[PDB]
Design an enzyme around this catalytic site. Structure first.
Site, mmCIF file in Angstrom:
data_model
loop_
_atom_site.group_PDB
_atom_site.id
_atom_site.type_symbol
_atom_site.label_atom_id
_atom_site.label_comp_id
_atom_site.label_asym_id
_atom_site.label_seq_id
_atom_site.Cartn_x
_atom_site.Cartn_y
_atom_site.Cartn_z
ATOM 1 C CE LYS A 205 44.105 41.447 42.066
ATOM 2 N NZ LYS A 205 44.194 41.360 40.568
ATOM 3 C CG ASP B 205 54.995 49.494 40.350
ATOM 4 O OD1 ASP B 205 55.833 50.047 39.596
ATOM 5 O OD2 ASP B 205 54.176 48.638 39.934
ATOM 6 C CG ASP C 116 50.621 48.801 44.215
ATOM 7 O OD1 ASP C 116 51.116 48.672 43.070
ATOM 8 O OD2 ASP C 116 51.255 48.529 45.249
HETATM 9 O O1 LIG Z 1 45.409 48.956 44.312
HETATM 10 C C1 LIG Z 1 45.449 47.938 44.982
HETATM 11 N N1 LIG Z 1 44.847 46.819 44.584
HETATM 12 C C2 LIG Z 1 44.185 46.669 43.415
HETATM 13 C C3 LIG Z 1 44.502 45.559 42.636
HETATM 14 C C4 LIG Z 1 43.837 45.331 41.434
HETATM 15 C C5 LIG Z 1 42.845 46.217 41.029
HETATM 16 C C6 LIG Z 1 42.514 47.341 41.797
HETATM 17 N N2 LIG Z 1 41.551 48.248 41.446
HETATM 18 C C7 LIG Z 1 41.126 48.612 40.198
HETATM 19 C C8 LIG Z 1 41.771 48.230 39.012
HETATM 20 C C9 LIG Z 1 41.288 48.625 37.765
HETATM 21 C C10 LIG Z 1 40.147 49.410 37.738
HETATM 22 C C11 LIG Z 1 39.465 49.812 38.899
HETATM 23 C C12 LIG Z 1 39.984 49.412 40.131
HETATM 24 N N3 LIG Z 1 38.380 50.589 38.587
HETATM 25 C C13 LIG Z 1 38.313 50.709 37.259
HETATM 26 O O2 LIG Z 1 37.402 51.368 36.638
HETATM 27 C C14 LIG Z 1 39.398 49.977 36.609
HETATM 28 C C15 LIG Z 1 39.806 49.776 35.192
HETATM 29 C C16 LIG Z 1 39.030 50.352 34.063
HETATM 30 C C17 LIG Z 1 39.391 50.161 32.736
HETATM 31 C C18 LIG Z 1 38.429 50.868 32.028
HETATM 32 C C19 LIG Z 1 37.563 51.432 32.961
HETATM 33 N N4 LIG Z 1 37.945 51.108 34.234
HETATM 34 C C20 LIG Z 1 43.187 47.547 42.999
HETATM 35 N N5 LIG Z 1 46.060 47.846 46.170
HETATM 36 C C21 LIG Z 1 46.742 48.819 46.827
HETATM 37 C C22 LIG Z 1 47.563 48.429 47.875
HETATM 38 C C23 LIG Z 1 48.289 49.383 48.577
HETATM 39 C C24 LIG Z 1 48.196 50.732 48.232
HETATM 40 C C25 LIG Z 1 47.383 51.129 47.178
HETATM 41 C C26 LIG Z 1 47.268 52.577 46.788
HETATM 42 F F1 LIG Z 1 47.503 53.370 47.810
HETATM 43 F F2 LIG Z 1 46.043 52.834 46.380
HETATM 44 F F3 LIG Z 1 48.161 52.818 45.840
HETATM 45 C C27 LIG Z 1 46.654 50.175 46.485
#
Ligand SMILES: O=C(Nc1cccc(Nc2ccc3c(c2)NC(=O)/C3=C\c2ccc[nH]2)c1)Nc1cccc(C(F)(F)F)c1
Ligand SMILES: [Cl-]
Length: 263
Positions: free
Chosen positions: A40, A130, A148
């Site tokens: 990201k 959320d 998240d």
């Molecule tokens: O999750 C967070 N940030 C964030 C923001 C944007 C992306 C991600 N990670 C992410 C998103 C999408 C995918 C991924 C990781 N791995 C994949 O494989 C994803 C999508 C996909 C589509 C088709 C295959 N894979 C985290 N932050 C966060 C902050 C506080 C708490 C938490 C918690 F605890 F995990 F909920 C969390």
């Protein structure tokens, strides 16, 4: 301070848009030479500060059912976080694409994994605010983790700040009081989501009416494929007063036990 793990920008090879990229990442896996990751990237004032804080948080906010955070990448331009790759994408979408296919045992296994992440989240005194299937990812073999991802194609699930009101308890609607107990409320709704294959709660209802109906003490009805015990767990999440709600440890224990005992 917390030392966030740094990943060299050159160790990331972008492959494909998943604002997130599928990537190969080198010098990371103990075993394999490279491993798939999700990347990201973003650059504003309280973006850069929020980013660093989030990285520090995620550095220790780590658990089998939380999206694995590997570290941050490069030296700033742009700001990059490196997360695990979960091949099946977000749970909301996955539910919807596995709908009138997913059996009871699977739904429990999904639900129980999410409760497991929430038990860890509560132990860390972390209020998520959320929680919903749109914020879970699905890996190999129905592996489910909580992340998240912020508040585009789920814009209808939020209300013009942005509020996921359909997943919120009364005290959060009214006083913006967010606690583990409001997270528990949300979990009840995730539970409803799971057993309806990712349908939107209160779909027939406008945001304003949702705010009305939640305040009134009205709760979601039981889905056709939802065994009464599971709906009961749903209700324990939806007690009007938060201290009367089941806590996440009990919920997990119940869901886990049902899942284990189901063919
Ligand atoms: O999750 C967070 N940030 C964030 C923001 C944007 C992306 C991600 N990670 C992410 C998103 C999408 C995918 C991924 C990781 N791995 C994949 O494989 C994803 C999508 C996909 C589509 C088709 C295959 N894979 C985290 N932050 C966060 C902050 C506080 C708490 C938490 C918690 F605890 F995990 F909920 C969390
Ligand atoms: Cl690249």
């Amino acid at each position: 301070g917390i030392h966030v793990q740094h990943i060299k920008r050159r160790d990331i090879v972008l492959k494909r848009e998943l604002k997130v990229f599928l990537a190969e990442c080198y010098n990371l896996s103990p075993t394999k030479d490279k491993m798939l990751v999700a990347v990201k990237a973003l650059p504003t004032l309280a973006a850069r500060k929020d980013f660093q804080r989030e990285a520090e948080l995620l550095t220790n906010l780590q658990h089998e059912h939380i999206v694995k955070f590997y570290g941050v990448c490069g030296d700033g331009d742009p700001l990059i976080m490196v997360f695990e790759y979960m091949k099946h994408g977000d749970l909301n979408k996955f539910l919807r694409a596995h709908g009138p296919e997913l059996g009871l045992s699977q739904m429990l296994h999904i639900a129980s994994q999410i409760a497991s992440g929430m038990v860890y989240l509560a132990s860390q005194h972390f209020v998520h605010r959320d929680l919903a299937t749109r914020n879970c990812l699905v890996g190999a073999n129905l592996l489910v983790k909580i992340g998240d991802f912020g508040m585009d194609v789920y814009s209808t699930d939020y209300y013009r700040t942005m509020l996921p009101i359909r997943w919120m308890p009364p005290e959060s609607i009214m006083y913006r009081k967010f606690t583990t107990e409001s997270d528990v409320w949300s979990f009840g709704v995730i539970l409803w989501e799971i057993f309806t294959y990712g349908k939107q709660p209160w779909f027939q209802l406008s945001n304003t009416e949702v705010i009305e109906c939640i305040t009134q003490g009205r709760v979601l009805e039981r889905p056709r494929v939802c065994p009464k015990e599971v709906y009961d767990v749903m209700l324990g999440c939806w007690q009007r007063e938060p201290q009367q709600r089941l806590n996440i440890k009990e919920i997990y224990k119940i869901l886990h036990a049902l899942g284990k005992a189901t063919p």
